[PDB]
């Protein structure tokens, strides 16, 4: 079974215009969290182990040659694109969970927004691996042999962003279904 | 295999504004019909038995503190939220099928819109169980050993609604793929 | 495992108005590619054989009685509806792959847009079978026992279109996830 995703804050997304000042067809956006998540029939949620790597793959289909972001101020020229990901707390959606990336020496760095090049008329595959939640979910412990009625969850947010004129604008974002993160 | 859902009448949905008169980021909305449905490879559709309970779970992520619905008349204050569900006939989409909920004494009541409290910055899980279709689908009977070419279907509609100034406004709705409902 | 679909160019779609000049609720649209596709764990993509038939089913739920398309010029009367499908190249999204339909004598015709009748208040099921890609994907060959790092892919585009006043307008479209097409 596979982690499901849904559009996150679609009414907040900026759009893209090309060099002819024509709006681009909406870009195709697909998020796939391949390794790292297992569905627990008894918990009715995806589970992972904080110790294990998980990986996220994003396919971004750029349908034309973008040059501007349309903003409140209007059309501003594109500086670059960023992929951003973070957890949020299902019972406190305004609270983020850092994601971390373990390096080849098993150190960990907090995962910062990464620059992506999105050539026109192409789908670009972006794979981010060796990821970890910086946190476990609260109340994982079973109570009365049944799931803790105060079981807490995270959700994953994967967003594509455009930097233009010293602000950021979301182009596309998806949020996952709830996840339990357990210790060992 | 799992029942798939899609946005239902997205161009008819009202939006929510907070106390600062700012529009809320679109709320996250996920519908899961857990128990009650089985996929029939030969019928190429989900099947259930009218006798069996089915259950629906809705996760509603409220991203901010809602206070107003934006309406044709403009911003009106929120009275409450309702979850509404009903079947429709795939060959007559303007025709509803009542859903019923069997009580703890095996009586059945028609399932009325239920009040839901949606605290801000939280995902609220709403589970509606012990549900039944008030009807079977027509033409379930096999003809020539093949599926009845007049096989009929229902689809499930699960909608989140806001009551404000003595009218109702849809905030989010999803409709399922087709379902066959059989007798025993 | 099942081919996943996503809305394609949603900001380019026209809407429908009825005889009372009221906009129709957005039509329900679901695309299912049943036979013809198999998921390859090692390639992390759906695969098919160019020799094999694949089939596509579309469920179109018409919610009211459409009479006009809303266009740049404004409301124009509906002539008919067309289903259109084609591949595109994932590394060149502006490049189509013809789909072909093999006839009952194993000839093949290029698959042209097909007229569909969409009666009001009904879901219409449209099944298009005996389909083939006119092409294989480039670089299918394994390199160093690992997938070719230049592996190419198609995506399927299935679109519902309205003909009005000698132009076409897209009402709904979905695009699949990437596909490898192999020879025998």
Residue numbers in the entry:
A (entry chain A), B (entry chain A), C (entry chain A): 349 to 532
How do the authors describe this structure?
Myelin-gene Regulatory Factor (MyRF, also known as MRF, Gm98 or C11Orf9 in human) is considered one of the master transcription factors for myelin production by oligodendrocytes in the central nervous system, which permits action potentials to propagate by saltatory conduction along axons and is very important for powerful brain functions. MyRF was revealed as a transmembrane (TM) protein located at the endoplasmic reticulum (ER) membrane. Its cytoplasmic portion contains an N-terminal proline-rich region and a following DNA binding domain (DBD) which can be auto-cleaved from the ER membrane by a region between the DNA-binding and TM domains. After cleavage, the N-terminal part of MyRF releases from the ER membrane and enters the cell nucleus guided by the NLS signal within its sequence to activate myelin gene expression.
Using limited proteolysis, we generated a proteolytically resistant DBD core that is about 24kD. The structural model has been completed and refined to 2.46 Å resolution (Rwork = 18% and Rfree = 23%). The space group is P321 (104.0, 104.0, 46.7, 90, 90, 120), with one molecule per asymmetric unit. Of the 210 amino acids corresponding to the DBD, only residues 351–532 were clearly visible in the electron density map. The main part of MyRF DBD consists of two antiparallel β-sheets that have three strands (a, b and e) and five strands (c’, c, f, g and β1) respectively, labeled according to the standard nomenclature of Ig-fold. The sheets pack against each other, forming a β-sandwich with a “Greek key” topology. MyRF DBD forms a trimer with a crystallographic three-fold symmetry axis in the crystal. Residues 438–442 of the loop between strand c and β7 from one protomer form 3 hydrogen bond interactions with residues 469–471 of strand e from the neighboring protomer. Residues 354–360 of the loop between strand β1 and β2 from one protomer form 4 hydrogen bond interactions with residues 371–377 of the loop before strand a from the other protomer. The electrostatic surface potential measurement of MyRF DBD structure reveals a highly electropositive surface owing to the presence of lysine and arginine residues at the bottom of the β-barrel core. In particular, 3 conserved alkaline residues in MyRF (K399, R454 and R478) are superimposable with the residues of Ndt80 (R111, R177 and R254) interacting at the major groove of DNA, implying that they may be involved in interaction with DNA too.
